[PDB]
Paper text:
Whereas all 12 residues could be built into each PMI(8,12)-a peptide complexed with MDM2, PMI(4,8)-a was fully defined in only 3 copies of the MDMX complex with no density observed for Ser11 and/or Pro12. In both complexes, however, the crystallographic density for all atoms of the crosslink formed between Lys(i) and Cys(i + 4) unambiguously defined the geometry of the DTC staple. The rigidity of PMI(8,12)-a or PMI(4,8)-a increased to such an extent that the local buried surface area (BSA) slightly decreased as compared with the BSA contributed by PMI to its interface with MDM2/MDMX. We deduced the DTC structure of the predominant epimer from the crystal structures of PMI(4,8)-a and PMI(8,12)-a in respective complex with MDMX and MDM2, where Cys8 or Cys12 remained as an l-amino acid residue as shown in the electron density maps.
Here we report a novel peptide stapling strategy based on the dithiocarbamate chemistry linking the side chains of residues Lys(i) and Cys(i + 4) of unprotected peptides and apply it to a series of dodecameric peptide antagonists of the p53-inhibitory oncogenic proteins MDM2 and MDMX. Previous structural and functional studies of PMI (TSFAEYWNLLSP) identified Phe3, Trp7 and Leu10 as the most critical residues for MDM2/MDMX binding.
Author numbering:
A (entry chain B): 1 to 12
B (entry chain A): 25 to 107
The structure:
């Protein structure tokens, strides 16, 4: 599981 | 709805490759994501952990490290730096 997959588990 | 960043975040946002003076919370969250990716600040093993202390990101957040599974340190800074 990459950081760019973790990051987009957050709402904007 | 737009917001103006304070100077430190602004510089970081332009360092990401964003343009302009006023941003939405949506676009600030993209370019912060873009910033960490290009600056390679996330830990290569535990990719949820970000180590920012030696960067300009660290002094802005008031931290050394943070995790994305808990982004309440992001909330701290967005509340303080986006008027």
């Amino acid at each position: 599981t990459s950081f760019k997959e973790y990051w987009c588990l957050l709402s904007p | 709805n737009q917001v103006r960043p304070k100077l430190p975040l602004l510089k970081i946002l332009h360092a990401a490759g964003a343009q302009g003076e006023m941003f939405t919370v949506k676009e600030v969250m993209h370019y912060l994501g873009q910033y960490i990716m290009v600056k390679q600040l996330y830990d290569a093993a535990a990719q949820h952990m970000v180590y920012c202390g030696g960067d300009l990101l660290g002094e802005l957040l008031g931290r050394q490290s943070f995790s994305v599974k808990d982004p309440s340190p992001l909330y701290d800074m967005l509340r303080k730096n986006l008027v």
